[PDB]
Amino acid sequence: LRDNIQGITKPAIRRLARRGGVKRISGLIYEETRGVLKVFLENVIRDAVTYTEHAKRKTVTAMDVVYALKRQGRTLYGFG
Amino acid sequence: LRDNIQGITKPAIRRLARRGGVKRISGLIYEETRGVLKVFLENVIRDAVTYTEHAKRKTVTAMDVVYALKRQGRTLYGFG
Amino acid sequence: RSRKESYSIYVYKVLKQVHPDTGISSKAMGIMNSFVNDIFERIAGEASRLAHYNKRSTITSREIQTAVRLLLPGELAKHAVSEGTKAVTKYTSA
Amino acid sequence: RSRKESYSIYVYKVLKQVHPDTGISSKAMGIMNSFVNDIFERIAGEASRLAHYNKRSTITSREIQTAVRLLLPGELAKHAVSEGTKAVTKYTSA
Amino acid sequence: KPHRYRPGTVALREIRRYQKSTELLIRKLPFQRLVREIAQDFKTDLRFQSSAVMALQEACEAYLVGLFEDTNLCAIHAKRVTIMPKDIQLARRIRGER
Amino acid sequence: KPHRYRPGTVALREIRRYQKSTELLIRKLPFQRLVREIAQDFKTDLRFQSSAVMALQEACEAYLVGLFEDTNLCAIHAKRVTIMPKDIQLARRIRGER
Amino acid sequence: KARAKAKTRSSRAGLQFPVGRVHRLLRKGNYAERVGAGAPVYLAAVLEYLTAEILELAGNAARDNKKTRIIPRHLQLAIRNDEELNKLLGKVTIAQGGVLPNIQAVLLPKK
Amino acid sequence: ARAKAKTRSSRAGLQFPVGRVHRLLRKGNYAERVGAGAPVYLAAVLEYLTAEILELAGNAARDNKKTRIIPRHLQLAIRNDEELNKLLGKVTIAQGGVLPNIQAVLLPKK
DNA sequence: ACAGGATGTATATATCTGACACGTGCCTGGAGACTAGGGAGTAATCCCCTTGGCGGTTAAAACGCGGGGGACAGCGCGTACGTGCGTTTAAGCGGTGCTAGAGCTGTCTACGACCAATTGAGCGGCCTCGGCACCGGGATTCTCCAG
DNA sequence: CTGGAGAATCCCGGTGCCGAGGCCGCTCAATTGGTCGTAGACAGCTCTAGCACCGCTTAAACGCACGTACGCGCTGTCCCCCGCGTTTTAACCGCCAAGGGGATTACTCCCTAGTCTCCAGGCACGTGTCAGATATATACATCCTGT
């Protein structure tokens, strides 16, 4: 897989901003948002894959994701 | 023991802002800083007093303050 | 096979106690389950730290009470302390 | 009198093996002791959670390794993993 | 003469729409591909539960919405109604994410 | 005519002075009285170790210095050099105090 | 051999949350080498009270949404509308919960 | 006749106490069992982190023309090293001060 | 853009001075040795459930365009804040004394672990009906241009 | 300051469908009951240090006066983003199929708890002595007014 960060499209980022109560959006916001989302996703996935490797597993479970999230202070309800 | 928040003087808040790299300070900054300092101190002291009361002591120790800070994600090094 | 475990029946009992004619979905039930597990872990960890600080090898109702009034804010902590105290006093009698 | 515990002599040994002609103040030594205690507590708690997640009752060197690479960032994590693996190998070798 | 809402009113209408709603605002398949790409950067030939990718998407959307709330606060603080990358950078710097 | 420095220059020199040093910038006795007054409502006849008051002062000064750094960033964001209460409010709101 | 009829500890405490299950979890969680008899009772009471608060507020959020079933959106609305509950769960994200509807005053039309 | 005692720190080539770390692991109730290699691994990690921060702090002390590490030097060492700063970004060093930095917009105009 | 005048700040030496680092004596807590038992590693199996592909529908994304409204640069002004000085105030230092309470220390008792038998609470599975999602049609409200 | 067209939104009424909730069987985990060991509560003694007070010095706070530069309001201009229509595209849904590996069970072995004895590593204490503040004097380093 490659260049899949472009799958996070401009209208999707606009919708996320609208949920954040953003009225007007600069043109440079979308690339910045893709970068910050990539950084956040990299951190969470790195911790989750570390949890997966500790269990000698080859499948990343939802438990790994929620443990990774609550490790970053982003504790998530609804998946265990 | 009343109105001891005014003991946090305008020059003291000015020095604190100078250490924070603040070149120019508005005149209404000092009361706001006293308010935020009061809130922060109330939180930390409340936690420290809770720790002290659980130990059945009546002197707030340095360890109680350190634990109170560490509970709030503001761990302090240099007191145990 | 296996056998899982959750607070689903207890959360449902409390819901029927506080809202008799209100249901709850599986996603909301899972969120309540995660909430109960999270608060349990927070209170138990703070009580464990209290017992370790005070060089105690047992977690008592005092440790749980202090952990509750540390983690929970304000009126939430006050009412939680009242509920825990009344439950302990009711349990001791019976 | 009493009997207290600290990492002061170990921090001093490490300082002498990393900076022979350099001292350390009492406040700096206390800060280093607090740092060692805090990192110990962080790593041990993360390893405890790792053991509890996988339904394990023992904390081994692999739990500590996973906790270290979960807690330390970047080059610190890999260097610490290298140091720990080297120490474990040359400890089991003797 | 075609009808045209003035600039901003449709923006406010979709602000209300996406704050009232609760569904995921990112397409599922592109996000899953992004997640798998990052994971393959970390570990080769990994596998993901559907709930794992769903939890990742819920967390990422919550993080981005909160970040955009802080960014909007930063933009309004500068007497602006348009969010700019400087607002995002300031919000992340104050949050400590930098 | 007496020599005078232009506004902001001695301010910069004491920025450098107070970022070069490490001592506590709040007077010890007023802060200790404030700590005892705040603690008196939680519990009466309460006592404090000297190290406890020192730790409280160190933590409070570190917190206020960090808050003033974030406040300075907020003021610069609004194209100003004077920090204002709105800047402290924005910094605390983004940090999570509000 | 005249064993008395078993009474669950939750019933003795007058609770709905399981005192025995909480006691086992406290023992197995490596929190301390010993767990008092009143510790699971107190912890179960606190958990039940917090669950009751959240469920009451979420049922209220379902009432004015004219829904007879609690969904994640109702839990999110209840938690973020209550200042104390929001403070308790400030770092927690609720899946399929959404956000509170709020628009800044400067973004509204100026008239 | 017992053999000559050898500390597990010496057996692992470490300065930090493997025995004390093992006892603290078994007494902090992190798990009901603690492996043999876990304390030596943890002691190695702690000793490495101590070595890193002390190396940087001693360099700061040398740059400050002082032969004794004080809290200021530890603060400079932690905050200048971005990984060490990330590890200790939520901790405050007592008597450590702050990094000397002024925003460029505040500098004199001309 | 350059003198020079002035104030501030790194250098450069004496000079005590506490704090540091090192030496000692204990003593308690690691280390050597050995035993038992259960946790976990490994192997086998099985069956979710994850991945991959295909095809149709269409919702959403991408693109283009017109324009308006918001970002931003520039200007003016007036007031708030920085700077400096003389005055006041209370912090800080250094004593002194005293006593409240932290910190062991020994007894013992009540409380929690542990073991065995028992049973009923709770979980897995099945089933069904009604709450809510969907769809279609007014009713209503808000927007925006044109007056 | 409204009128009216237009578009979005809300209220309502009728299918329908799938998942929330109730029922049932089983089983394993909570109960009960009884015992035993030790954790801590509890009284008591000690002696540390926290509190309170006093006086003197002087650093710091404070109040005032002045001027300046910065915040903020206003204006223009301009171009960037928003609203909208059209075309494209790939997301989504449904279905199928295969096999990877999660996950459950059985066996055994080896690794860790627990003990007992023993000794030496580390801690409390004491003590020289030397980085290191701390006063000088000095040599620039900038700041700012003036030309």
Author numbering:
A (entry chain B), B (entry chain F): 22 to 101
C (entry chain H), D (entry chain D): 31 to 124
E (entry chain A), F (entry chain E): 37 to 134
G (entry chain G): 9 to 119
H (entry chain C): 10 to 119
Provide excerpts from the study:
Ubiquitination of lysine residues is a major histone modification that regulates various genomic processes such as transcription, replication, and DNA repair. Histone H2B monoubiquitination (at Lys120 in humans) regulates transcription elongation and DNA repair. In humans, H2B monoubiquitination is catalyzed by the heterodimeric Bre1 complex composed of Bre1A/RNF20 and Bre1B/RNF40. The three Bre1 proteins share a C-terminal RING domain, which is required for the ubiquitination of H2BK120 in humans and H2BK123 in yeasts.
We also determined the structure of the free nucleosome at 2.51 Å resolution as a reference. Bre1 binding does not induce a large conformational change in the nucleosome, but a region of the nucleosomal DNA that contacts Bre1 undergoes a small shift (approximately 3 Å). Since the local resolution of this DNA region is relatively low, as often observed in nucleosome structures, the functional significance of this small shift is unclear.
